[PDB]
Design a protein around this motif. Structure first.
Motif, PDB file in Angstrom:
ATOM      1  N   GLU A 128       5.582 -67.362 -49.061  1.00 27.03           N
ATOM      2  CA  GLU A 128       6.605 -67.159 -49.961  1.00 27.03           C
ATOM      3  C   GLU A 128       6.550 -67.684 -51.590  1.00 27.03           C
ATOM      4  O   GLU A 128       7.056 -67.345 -52.266  1.00 27.03           O
ATOM      5  N   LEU A 129       5.627 -68.945 -51.372  1.00 26.11           N
ATOM      6  CA  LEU A 129       5.439 -69.730 -52.373  1.00 26.11           C
ATOM      7  C   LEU A 129       4.732 -68.808 -53.525  1.00 26.11           C
ATOM      8  O   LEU A 129       4.647 -68.501 -54.819  1.00 26.11           O
ATOM      9  N   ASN A 130       3.644 -67.794 -52.954  1.00 24.90           N
ATOM     10  CA  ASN A 130       2.726 -67.144 -53.430  1.00 24.90           C
ATOM     11  C   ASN A 130       2.920 -65.703 -53.677  1.00 24.90           C
ATOM     12  O   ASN A 130       1.938 -64.877 -53.847  1.00 24.90           O
ATOM     13  N   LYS A 146       5.148 -70.542 -45.531  1.00 26.42           N
ATOM     14  CA  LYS A 146       5.606 -71.155 -46.996  1.00 26.42           C
ATOM     15  C   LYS A 146       4.480 -71.073 -48.037  1.00 26.42           C
ATOM     16  O   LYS A 146       4.780 -70.627 -48.957  1.00 26.42           O
ATOM     17  N   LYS A 185      -3.539 -76.143 -57.136  1.00 26.77           N
ATOM     18  CA  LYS A 185      -3.721 -74.815 -56.887  1.00 26.77           C
ATOM     19  C   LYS A 185      -5.295 -74.140 -57.052  1.00 26.77           C
ATOM     20  O   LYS A 185      -5.873 -75.073 -57.524  1.00 26.77           O
ATOM     21  N   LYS A 199      -0.622 -71.419 -55.254  1.00 30.24           N
ATOM     22  CA  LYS A 199       0.254 -72.826 -55.009  1.00 30.24           C
ATOM     23  C   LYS A 199      -0.586 -73.344 -53.641  1.00 30.24           C
ATOM     24  O   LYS A 199      -0.542 -72.483 -52.687  1.00 30.24           O
ATOM     25  N   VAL A 218      -0.505 -75.449 -50.321  1.00 27.81           N
ATOM     26  CA  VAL A 218       0.450 -76.274 -49.382  1.00 27.81           C
ATOM     27  C   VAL A 218      -0.311 -76.715 -48.271  1.00 27.81           C
ATOM     28  O   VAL A 218      -1.323 -76.194 -47.808  1.00 27.81           O
TER      29      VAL A 218
END
Length: 101
Positions: free
Chosen positions: A89-91, A86, A70, A76, A78
């Motif tokens: 959507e993760l963050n 991606k 991180k 996060k 990636v």
């Protein structure tokens, strides 16, 4: 020596596009790239192959770190192959809190 790994380590939706920070990391060095304004179409459509055709500052070189989990604000990290969507959507909720979404 080794195939470098490319990380999306920061993203921010801005007035004219997306501010994107990428780290390119091999065995020895970490090359950090700031893209001040990637067009939203590139980000929305996951056009990762074309990212390095867009304006970025000169790379900021430091020695490779042990972990790329991180960033400093908790997003996060990636790998670039996973795509911009991606990372978003993760963050998503984290970015919303910082008005980066």
């Amino acid at each position: 020596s080794m195939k470098s790994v490319k990380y999306i380590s920061n993203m921010s939706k801005q007035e004219k596009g997306y501010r994107v920070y990428v780290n390119v990391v091999n065995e020895d060095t970490d090359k950090g790239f700031l893209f001040p304004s990637v067009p939203k179409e590139v980000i929305e459509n996951d056009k990762i192959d074309e990212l390095f055709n867009f304006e970025h500052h000169k790379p900021y070189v430091q020695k490779a770190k042990s972990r790329y989990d991180k960033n400093g604000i908790g997003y996060k990290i990636v790998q670039l192959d996973e795509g911009f969507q991606k990372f978003i959507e993760l963050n998503k909720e984290k970015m919303k809190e910082n008005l980066d979404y």
